[PDB]
């Protein structure tokens, strides 16, 4: 009842004297290890597997046996482990190996349980739940297998911000699937029917949000991996009534904005002198641009309309302008050029000719349509600025606008680069360069830990902008001198504690915080936040 409890089990870290006292002498091999030694052993066990999915499989079995050792291993090898325990391995595990999630505590909803959502939550037997990750499996369709996405995401809040692993709930809202293989698969365990229409979808998701605010009143609700037809609408429906956010939309823009403002500082080319091609004009790409404007307005008090005019949006038609003669979608209107002639708009269609005309100092890659930041385009940006900022942010790694290596080569080390995925360093004439990864892990854990402590009535856009600024300000003079746009990913606990502290102070300034126990001054609150965090060490 010690060994079989994954929360108190220590395996070989039980001293001989503990083994005797606990009457488990002879249930373990004789070597006594420290946690650090166990982690090094587990690390070698992981690298004994070649395929990511088999590495993940090993780590799931570590989590089932000794949960402390699982988190200790992830934190000691975070950069290397991240692509294994979340994107892109996790989607492939959900799609083909969904059995790897069967043993993980989670909650399955569907229309069959309509009206009983609250009783299912009560029966799940949770104490003071702090974070809930919900998906529908729809940003191929995984349907019910989307539970794996919620599981993987919950685990990053535990690793990243020390959310206690017993106070986090992964949730699948199964509203059906349009995945035709699943609909015909004898082994699919979900609702075998096409996705429900919006009316029934919102009836079930409304019951979910009401039931959770009642049974899990202390929880942050985070939407993960919802398709475009619903993710924006979901936040508009719930942002004010419940304590919720969407990491794909709000986390991404918060992280990119923080890294982008640090790239502006290293460029010496100040924010109002920037000329920014935003390659890709979906709602998310436009959200990222707005988040950059909002952070620059907060950090530097330039008029936001002056920041908005640094942006040149490119959709599939070309430069978005008011004179190009089409009916612009609402999200594109605010960043539309007003200073470009109909005649010039007609000659502003390919990225090459847009770059030649605009003379940008920055390229933001949000296009999702492969490697458009050509050698020729990068060479042009080099005649407008001594430090081109190039952000190939499209995932997966195949969709990326340019490789950091190509960016560094073509600019002979002058490009300031942030990526969506990890990349190895590139060395040019004895000088080393490495892109700064804009990982979402920098923001969501801190937001979840801040909202878990402050208990705000809701998560207004101010708390996300605060987290964005906090992340920006954590990049030290030393980090900046070495070309880093973000604090180091390995220091995620310190990053999360700082982001959480600043999110709390913001909720206090807005008087939406419901926890009166917290300190209200930054130094004392930061110290308090750090002590509240769950640590993967053997405590008792």
Ligand X SMILES: O=C(Nc1cc(S(=O)(=O)Nc2ccc(OC(F)(F)F)cc2)ccc1Cl)c1cc(F)cc(F)c1
Which active-site residues does the annotation give? Answer: 86, 153
- Crossing angle of the two packed helices 351-358 and 375-382, in degrees rounded to 10: 0
- Per the structure block, which two tokens stand in for 98? 């969904």
Interacting span for a second copy (CB under 8 A) from 113-121, 227-235, 289-297, 402-410:
113-121
Do 436 and 486 contact (CB within 8 A), yes or no?
Answer: yes
Compute the C-alpha angle 82/84/89, nearest 5°: 120
Does the annotation flag 439 for ligand binding? yes
Number of residues that bind a second copy (CB under 8 A): 50
Do 530 and 502 contact (CB within 8 A), yes or no?
Answer: no
Q: Is 116 in the site for a second copy (CB under 8 A)?
A: yes
Closest approach of a second copy to the CB of residue 519, in Å: 38
Closest Cα to residue 352, out of 336, 370, 371, 376? 376
Separation CA 435–CA 438 (nearest Å): 9
Candidate residues 15, 34, 64, 229; the one interacting with a second copy per rule CB under 8 A = 64
Do 437 and 397 contact (CB within 8 A), yes or no?
Answer: no
Does the annotation flag 224 for ligand binding? yes
Interacting span for a second copy (CB under 8 A) from 53-61, 78-86, 359-367, 509-517:
53-61
Interacting span for a second copy (CB under 8 A) from 18-26, 252-260, 343-351, 411-419:
18-26
Closest approach of ligand X to the CB of residue 100, in Å: 7
Length, in residues, of the chain: 540
Residues with Cβ within 8 Å of 85's Cβ and at least 6 positions away in sequence, in order, are: 56, 59, 74, 152, 155, 156
Q: Which long-range contacts (CB under 8 A, 24 or more apart) does 146-150 make?
A: 146/94, 146/172, 146/225, 147/94, 147/98, 147/101, 147/104, 147/106, 147/108, 147/171, 147/172, 148/90, 148/93, 148/94, 148/98, 148/100, 148/101, 149/90, 149/91, 149/94, 149/224, 149/225, 150/106, 150/224
Q: Is 112 in the site for a second copy (CB under 8 A)?
A: yes
Closest approach of a second copy to the CB of residue 534, in Å: 21
Does the annotation flag 233 for ligand binding? no
Give the one entry of ligand X, a second copy, none that residue 519 binds, where binding means its C-beta sits below a cut-off of 5 to 8 angstroms depending on kind: none
Residue 172 vs 257, nearer CB to ligand X: 172
Closest approach of a second copy to the CB of residue 120, in Å: 4
Do 445 and 427 contact (CB within 8 A), yes or no?
Answer: no
Does the annotation flag 515 for ligand binding? no
Do 378 and 277 contact (CB within 8 A), yes or no?
Answer: no
Closest approach of ligand X to the CB of residue 78, in Å: 18
Separation CA 105–CA 147 (nearest Å): 10
Does the annotation flag 395 for ligand binding? yes
Separation CA 167–CA 125 (nearest Å): 11
Residue 147 vs 381, nearer CB to a second copy: 147
- Per the structure block, which two tokens stand in for 459? 């998560």
Q: Is 123 in the site for a second copy (CB under 8 A)?
A: yes
Residue 3 vs 382, nearer CB to ligand X: 3
Closest approach of a second copy to the CB of residue 170, in Å: 12
Give the one entry of a second copy, ligand X, none that residue 88 binds, where binding means its C-beta sits below a cut-off of 5 to 8 angstroms depending on kind: none
Candidate residues 2, 8, 18, 28; the one interacting with a second copy per rule CB under 8 A = 28
Candidate residues 2, 8, 24, 139; the one interacting with a second copy per rule CB under 8 A = 24
In the Cβ-directed half-sphere of 251, how many Cα atoms lie within 13 Å? 22
Residue 102 vs 300, nearer CB to ligand X: 102
Interacting span for a second copy (CB under 8 A) from 100-108, 127-135, 150-158, 423-431:
100-108
Map 138-156 to HEC letters.
CCCCCHHHHHHHHHHHHHH
Map 205-224 to HEC letters.
HHHHHHHHHHHCCCCEEEEC
Instruction: Kindly calculate the radius of gyration of the chain based on its CA atoms and give it in whole angstroms.
Output: 24
302-331 residues in contact with a second copy (CB under 8 A) are none
Give the one entry of ligand X, a second copy, none that residue 290 binds, where binding means its C-beta sits below a cut-off of 5 to 8 angstroms depending on kind: none
- Please identify the residue of the shown chain whose CB is closest to the bound ligand X: 11
187-206 residues in contact with a second copy (CB under 8 A) are 187-191
Q: Is 61 in the site for a second copy (CB under 8 A)?
A: yes
User: In this structure, what are the phi and psi dihedrals at residue 154, rounded to the nearest 5 degrees?
Assistant: -55, -40
Candidate residues 17, 47, 102, 140; the one interacting with a second copy per rule CB under 8 A = 102
- Per the structure block, which two tokens stand in for 221? 């609700």
Q: Is 31 in the site for a second copy (CB under 8 A)?
A: yes
Closest approach of a second copy to the CB of residue 220, in Å: 20
What b/e string do you get for 2-31 counting C-beta neighbours within 10 Å, with b at 16 or more? ebeebebbbbbbbeeeebeeeeeeeebeee
Residue ranges that bind ligand X, judged by CB under 6 A: 3-4, 9, 11-12, 27-29, 38, 42, 58, 61-62, 65-66, 69, 99, 102-105
Binding site residues, a second copy, CB under 8 A: 11-12, 23-31, 40-41, 44-45, 48, 54, 57-58, 60-61, 64-65, 96-97, 99, 102-103, 105-110, 112-113, 116, 119-120, 123-124, 144, 147, 174, 186-191
Residues forming the annotated binding site?
224-225, 248, 395, 439
Residues forming the annotated binding site for a divalent metal cation?
224-225, 248
């Amino acid at each position: 009842a010690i060994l079989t409890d994954r929360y108190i089990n220590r395996g070989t870290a039980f001293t001989m004297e503990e083994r005797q006292k606990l009457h488990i002498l002879g249930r373990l091999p004789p070597v006594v290890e420290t946690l650090e030694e166990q982690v090094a052993r587990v690390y070698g066990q992981v690298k004994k597997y070649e395929k990511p999915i088999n590495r993940y499989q090993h780590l799931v079995s570590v989590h089932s046996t000794n949960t402390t050792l699982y988190y200790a291993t992830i934190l000691a090898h975070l950069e290397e482990m991240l692509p294994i325990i979340y994107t892109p391995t996790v989607g492939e595990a959900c799609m083909e190996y969904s059995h790897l999630f069967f043993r993980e505590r989670g909650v399955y909803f569907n229309r069959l349980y309509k009206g009983q959502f609250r009783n299912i939550m009560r029966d799940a037997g949770y104490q003071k739940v702090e974070v809930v990750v919900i998906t529908d499996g729809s940003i191929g369709d995984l349907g019910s297998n989307g539970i794996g996405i919620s599981i993987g995401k919950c685990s990053l809040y535990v690793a990243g911000a020390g959310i206690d692993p017993r106070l986090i709930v992964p949730v699948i809202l199964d509203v059906g699937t349009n995945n035709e293989r699943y609909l015909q698969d004898k082994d699919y365990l979900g609702m075998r029917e096409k996705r429900l229409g919006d009316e029934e979808f919102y009836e079930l998701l409304d019951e979910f949000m009401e039931a959770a605010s009642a049974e899990w009143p202390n929880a942050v609700i985070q939407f993960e991996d919802f398709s475009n037809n619903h993710c924006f609408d979901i936040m508009e429906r719930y942002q004010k009534k419940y304590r919720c956010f969407n990491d794909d939309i709000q986390g991404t823009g918060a992280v990119i904005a923080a890294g982008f403002l640090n790239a502006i500082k290293l460029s010496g080319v100040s924010p109002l002198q920037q000329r920014i091609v935003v390659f890709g004009a979906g709602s998310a790409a436009v959200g990222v641009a707005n988040n950059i404007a909002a952070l620059a307005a907060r950090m530097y008090k330039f008029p936001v309309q002056d920041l908005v005019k640094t942006f040149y949006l490119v959709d599939t038609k070309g430069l978005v302008t008011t004179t190009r003669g089409d009916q612009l979608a609402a999200h594109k209107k605010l960043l539309a050029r007003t200073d470009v002639s109909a005649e010039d708009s007609a000659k502003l269609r390919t990225l090459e000719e847009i770059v030649r005309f605009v003379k940008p100092t920055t390229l933001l890659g949000l296009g999702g349509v492969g490697p458009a930041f050509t050698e020729e385009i990068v060479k042009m940006v080099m005649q407008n600025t001594e430090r081109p900022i190039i952000f190939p942010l499209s995932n997966p790694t195949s969709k990326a606008e340019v490789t950091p290596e190509n960016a560094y080569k073509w600019t002979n080390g002058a490009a300031i680069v942030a990526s969506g995925s990890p990349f190895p360093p590139t060395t040019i004439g004895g000088k080393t360069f490495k892109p700064s990864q804009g990982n979402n892990l920098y923001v969501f854990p801190g937001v979840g830990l801040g909202c878990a402590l402050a208990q705000p009535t809701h998560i207004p856009e101010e708390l996300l902008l605060t987290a964005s600024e906090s992340l920006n300000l954590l990049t030290t003079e030393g980090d900046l001198r070495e070309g880093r746009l973000y604090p180091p990913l390995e220091d995620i606990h310190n990053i999360s504690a700082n982001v959480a502290t600043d999110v709390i102070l913001e909720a206090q300034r807005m008087k939406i915080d419901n926890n009166k126990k917290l300190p209200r001054t930054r130094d004392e609150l930061l110290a308090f936040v750090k002590k509240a965090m769950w640590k993967p060490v053997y405590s008792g």
